Amino acid sequence: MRSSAKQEELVKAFKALLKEEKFSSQGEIVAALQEQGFDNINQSKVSRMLTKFGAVRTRNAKMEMVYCLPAELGVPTT
């Protein structure tokens, strides 16, 4: 019985957005999360999360170089 609104959402959202293979830059996912429901996001937050989580830029179904997520890296805990 503990309803504490912690930032364990910005992490599920971040990893999910990347794994969908749509965003081709930081600023792209920066704006995306603002539409999702995060008013605490900027270019530094997105560039920091990319380096922190360890995302990779790869060619998708249509050869577009977009941001995606490799093997399980960045489990919610801290």
GROMACS .gro file of N, CA and C in nm:
model
  234
    1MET      N    1   0.085  -0.122   0.000
    1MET     CA    2   0.000   0.000   0.000
    1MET      C    3   0.088   0.126   0.000
    2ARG      N    4   0.149   0.154  -0.115
    2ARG     CA    5   0.238   0.269  -0.131
    2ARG      C    6   0.224   0.325  -0.273
    3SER      N    7   0.154   0.436  -0.284
    3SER     CA    8   0.131   0.503  -0.412
    3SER      C    9   0.223   0.625  -0.426
    4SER      N   10   0.350   0.599  -0.457
    4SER     CA   11   0.450   0.704  -0.475
    4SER      C   12   0.479   0.725  -0.623
    5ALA      N   13   0.449   0.845  -0.674
    5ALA     CA   14   0.472   0.878  -0.815
    5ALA      C   15   0.620   0.901  -0.843
    6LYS      N   16   0.694   0.792  -0.864
    6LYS     CA   17   0.837   0.798  -0.895
    6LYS      C   18   0.858   0.799  -1.047
    7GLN      N   19   0.978   0.834  -1.092
    7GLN     CA   20   1.008   0.842  -1.236
    7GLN      C   21   1.042   0.705  -1.296
    8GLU      N   22   0.972   0.601  -1.250
    8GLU     CA   23   0.985   0.466  -1.308
    8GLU      C   24   0.901   0.453  -1.436
    9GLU      N   25   0.849   0.566  -1.485
    9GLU     CA   26   0.769   0.570  -1.607
    9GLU      C   27   0.852   0.621  -1.725
   10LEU      N   28   0.929   0.728  -1.701
   10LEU     CA   29   1.017   0.784  -1.805
   10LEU      C   30   1.113   0.678  -1.860
   11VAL      N   31   1.140   0.574  -1.779
   11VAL     CA   32   1.228   0.464  -1.821
   11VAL      C   33   1.154   0.362  -1.909
   12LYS      N   34   1.032   0.322  -1.872
   12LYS     CA   35   0.957   0.225  -1.955
   12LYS      C   36   0.923   0.286  -2.090
   13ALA      N   37   0.881   0.412  -2.083
   13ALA     CA   38   0.850   0.492  -2.202
   13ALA      C   39   0.972   0.505  -2.294
   14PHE      N   40   1.086   0.546  -2.237
   14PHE     CA   41   1.211   0.563  -2.313
   14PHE      C   42   1.249   0.436  -2.392
   15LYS      N   43   1.270   0.326  -2.319
   15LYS     CA   44   1.305   0.197  -2.378
   15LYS      C   45   1.204   0.151  -2.484
   16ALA      N   46   1.075   0.172  -2.457
   16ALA     CA   47   0.968   0.134  -2.549
   16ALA      C   48   0.976   0.214  -2.680
   17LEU      N   49   0.985   0.347  -2.669
   17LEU     CA   50   0.995   0.437  -2.786
   17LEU      C   51   1.106   0.393  -2.881
   18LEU      N   52   1.224   0.365  -2.825
   18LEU     CA   53   1.340   0.320  -2.903
   18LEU      C   54   1.314   0.185  -2.970
   19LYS      N   55   1.264   0.089  -2.891
   19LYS     CA   56   1.238  -0.047  -2.940
   19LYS      C   57   1.130  -0.052  -3.050
   20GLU      N   58   1.048   0.053  -3.061
   20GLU     CA   59   0.946   0.062  -3.168
   20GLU      C   60   1.011   0.090  -3.306
   21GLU      N   61   1.134   0.145  -3.304
   21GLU     CA   62   1.210   0.179  -3.425
   21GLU      C   63   1.137   0.282  -3.512
   22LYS      N   64   1.135   0.406  -3.464
   22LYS     CA   65   1.066   0.516  -3.532
   22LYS      C   66   1.147   0.646  -3.526
   23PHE      N   67   1.206   0.673  -3.409
   23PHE     CA   68   1.282   0.796  -3.385
   23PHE      C   69   1.423   0.788  -3.441
   24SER      N   70   1.459   0.887  -3.522
   24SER     CA   71   1.589   0.890  -3.590
   24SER      C   72   1.689   0.986  -3.525
   25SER      N   73   1.650   1.049  -3.414
   25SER     CA   74   1.739   1.142  -3.342
   25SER      C   75   1.692   1.162  -3.198
   26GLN      N   76   1.773   1.231  -3.118
   26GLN     CA   77   1.741   1.262  -2.978
   26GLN      C   78   1.619   1.354  -2.970
   27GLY      N   79   1.631   1.472  -3.031
   27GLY     CA   80   1.522   1.571  -3.035
   27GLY      C   81   1.386   1.513  -3.077
   28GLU      N   82   1.389   1.407  -3.159
   28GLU     CA   83   1.268   1.339  -3.204
   28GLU      C   84   1.196   1.270  -3.087
   29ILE      N   85   1.271   1.193  -3.008
   29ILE     CA   86   1.215   1.124  -2.890
   29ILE      C   87   1.194   1.222  -2.773
   30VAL      N   88   1.267   1.335  -2.774
   30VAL     CA   89   1.249   1.442  -2.674
   30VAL      C   90   1.105   1.496  -2.682
   31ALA      N   91   1.064   1.531  -2.804
   31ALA     CA   92   0.929   1.582  -2.830
   31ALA      C   93   0.822   1.474  -2.808
   32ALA      N   94   0.852   1.351  -2.852
   32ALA     CA   95   0.759   1.237  -2.839
   32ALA      C   96   0.713   1.216  -2.694
   33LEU      N   97   0.808   1.212  -2.600
   33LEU     CA   98   0.775   1.191  -2.458
   33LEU      C   99   0.694   1.308  -2.400
   34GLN      N  100   0.707   1.429  -2.457
   34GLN     CA  101   0.627   1.543  -2.412
   34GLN      C  102   0.478   1.521  -2.445
   35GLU      N  103   0.454   1.452  -2.557
   35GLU     CA  104   0.318   1.418  -2.601
   35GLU      C  105   0.263   1.299  -2.520
   36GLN      N  106   0.354   1.208  -2.479
   36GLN     CA  107   0.318   1.091  -2.399
   36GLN      C  108   0.265   1.131  -2.261
   37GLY      N  109   0.339   1.219  -2.193
   37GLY     CA  110   0.298   1.265  -2.061
   37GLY      C  111   0.415   1.297  -1.970
   38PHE      N  112   0.522   1.353  -2.027
   38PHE     CA  113   0.642   1.388  -1.950
   38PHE      C  114   0.685   1.532  -1.979
   39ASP      N  115   0.660   1.620  -1.883
   39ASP     CA  116   0.696   1.762  -1.895
   39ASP      C  117   0.832   1.791  -1.830
   40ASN      N  118   0.908   1.685  -1.806
   40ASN     CA  119   1.042   1.693  -1.749
   40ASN      C  120   1.141   1.623  -1.842
   41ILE      N  121   1.146   1.669  -1.967
   41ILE     CA  122   1.232   1.609  -2.069
   41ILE      C  123   1.292   1.718  -2.159
   42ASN      N  124   1.420   1.700  -2.194
   42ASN     CA  125   1.492   1.791  -2.283
   42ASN      C  126   1.601   1.715  -2.360
   43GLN      N  127   1.672   1.785  -2.448
   43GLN     CA  128   1.779   1.724  -2.530
   43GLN      C  129   1.887   1.658  -2.444
   44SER      N  130   1.920   1.720  -2.331
   44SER     CA  131   2.020   1.666  -2.238
   44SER      C  132   1.970   1.538  -2.169
   45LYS      N  133   1.841   1.537  -2.130
   45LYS     CA  134   1.778   1.420  -2.067
   45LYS      C  135   1.776   1.299  -2.161
   46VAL      N  136   1.747   1.326  -2.288
   46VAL     CA  137   1.739   1.223  -2.392
   46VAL      C  138   1.878   1.174  -2.434
   47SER      N  139   1.974   1.265  -2.447
   47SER     CA  140   2.112   1.226  -2.481
   47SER      C  141   2.177   1.150  -2.365
   48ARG      N  142   2.143   1.189  -2.241
   48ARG     CA  143   2.194   1.122  -2.121
   48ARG      C  144   2.134   0.982  -2.108
   49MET      N  145   2.004   0.969  -2.134
   49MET     CA  146   1.936   0.839  -2.127
   49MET      C  147   1.985   0.744  -2.238
   50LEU      N  148   2.017   0.798  -2.356
   50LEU     CA  149   2.072   0.717  -2.466
   50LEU      C  150   2.206   0.654  -2.427
   51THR      N  151   2.294   0.736  -2.370
   51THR     CA  152   2.426   0.690  -2.324
   51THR      C  153   2.414   0.601  -2.199
   52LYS      N  154   2.324   0.638  -2.107
   52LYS     CA  155   2.299   0.562  -1.983
   52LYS      C  156   2.245   0.422  -2.013
   53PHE      N  157   2.133   0.416  -2.087
   53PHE     CA  158   2.069   0.289  -2.123
   53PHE      C  159   2.152   0.211  -2.227
   54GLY      N  160   2.222   0.283  -2.315
   54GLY     CA  161   2.306   0.220  -2.416
   54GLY      C  162   2.230   0.180  -2.541
   55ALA      N  163   2.161   0.276  -2.602
   55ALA     CA  164   2.086   0.251  -2.725
   55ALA      C  165   2.179   0.252  -2.847
   56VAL      N  166   2.131   0.196  -2.959
   56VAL     CA  167   2.210   0.187  -3.083
   56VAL      C  168   2.131   0.240  -3.204
   57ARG      N  169   2.202   0.302  -3.299
   57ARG     CA  170   2.140   0.352  -3.422
   57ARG      C  171   2.153   0.245  -3.532
   58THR      N  172   2.040   0.192  -3.578
   58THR     CA  173   2.041   0.084  -3.679
   58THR      C  174   1.937   0.107  -3.789
   59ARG      N  175   1.958   0.038  -3.902
   59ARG     CA  176   1.866   0.044  -4.015
   59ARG      C  177   1.742  -0.042  -3.986
   60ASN      N  178   1.624   0.018  -3.998
   60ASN     CA  179   1.497  -0.052  -3.972
   60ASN      C  180   1.447  -0.125  -4.097
   61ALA      N  181   1.318  -0.161  -4.098
   61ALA     CA  182   1.258  -0.234  -4.211
   61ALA      C  183   1.278  -0.163  -4.346
   62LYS      N  184   1.270  -0.029  -4.347
   62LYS     CA  185   1.288   0.049  -4.470
   62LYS      C  186   1.427   0.113  -4.481
   63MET      N  187   1.527   0.055  -4.414
   63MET     CA  188   1.666   0.102  -4.422
   63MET      C  189   1.689   0.239  -4.356
   64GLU      N  190   1.593   0.288  -4.278
   64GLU     CA  191   1.607   0.416  -4.209
   64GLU      C  192   1.689   0.400  -4.082
   65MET      N  193   1.796   0.479  -4.070
   65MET     CA  194   1.885   0.474  -3.953
   65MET      C  195   1.818   0.536  -3.831
   66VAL      N  196   1.750   0.454  -3.751
   66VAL     CA  197   1.679   0.500  -3.632
   66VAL      C  198   1.735   0.438  -3.504
   67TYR      N  199   1.702   0.500  -3.392
   67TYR     CA  200   1.744   0.455  -3.260
   67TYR      C  201   1.663   0.332  -3.216
   68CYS      N  202   1.734   0.230  -3.169
   68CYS     CA  203   1.671   0.108  -3.117
   68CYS      C  204   1.744   0.062  -2.991
   69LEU      N  205   1.692  -0.042  -2.928
   69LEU     CA  206   1.751  -0.096  -2.806
   69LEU      C  207   1.808  -0.236  -2.828
   70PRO      N  208   1.935  -0.258  -2.788
   70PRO     CA  209   2.000  -0.391  -2.797
   70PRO      C  210   1.945  -0.486  -2.689
   71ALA      N  211   2.025  -0.585  -2.650
   71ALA     CA  212   1.987  -0.680  -2.544
   71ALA      C  213   1.951  -0.606  -2.414
   72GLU      N  214   1.875  -0.673  -2.326
   72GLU     CA  215   1.827  -0.615  -2.200
   72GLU      C  216   1.938  -0.541  -2.122
   73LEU      N  217   1.929  -0.408  -2.124
   73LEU     CA  218   2.027  -0.321  -2.059
   73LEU      C  219   1.957  -0.197  -2.003
   74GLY      N  220   1.959  -0.182  -1.871
   74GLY     CA  221   1.896  -0.068  -1.805
   74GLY      C  222   1.770  -0.107  -1.730
   75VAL      N  223   1.784  -0.201  -1.636
   75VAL     CA  224   1.672  -0.247  -1.553
   75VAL      C  225   1.635  -0.140  -1.449
   76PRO      N  226   1.503  -0.111  -1.431
   76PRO     CA  227   1.457  -0.010  -1.333
   76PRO      C  228   1.491  -0.051  -1.189
   77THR      N  229   1.569   0.033  -1.121
   77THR     CA  230   1.613   0.004  -0.984
   77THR      C  231   1.669   0.129  -0.913
   78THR      N  232   1.740   0.215  -0.987
   78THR     CA  233   1.799   0.337  -0.931
   78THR      C  234   1.785   0.453  -1.030
   0.00000   0.00000   0.00000
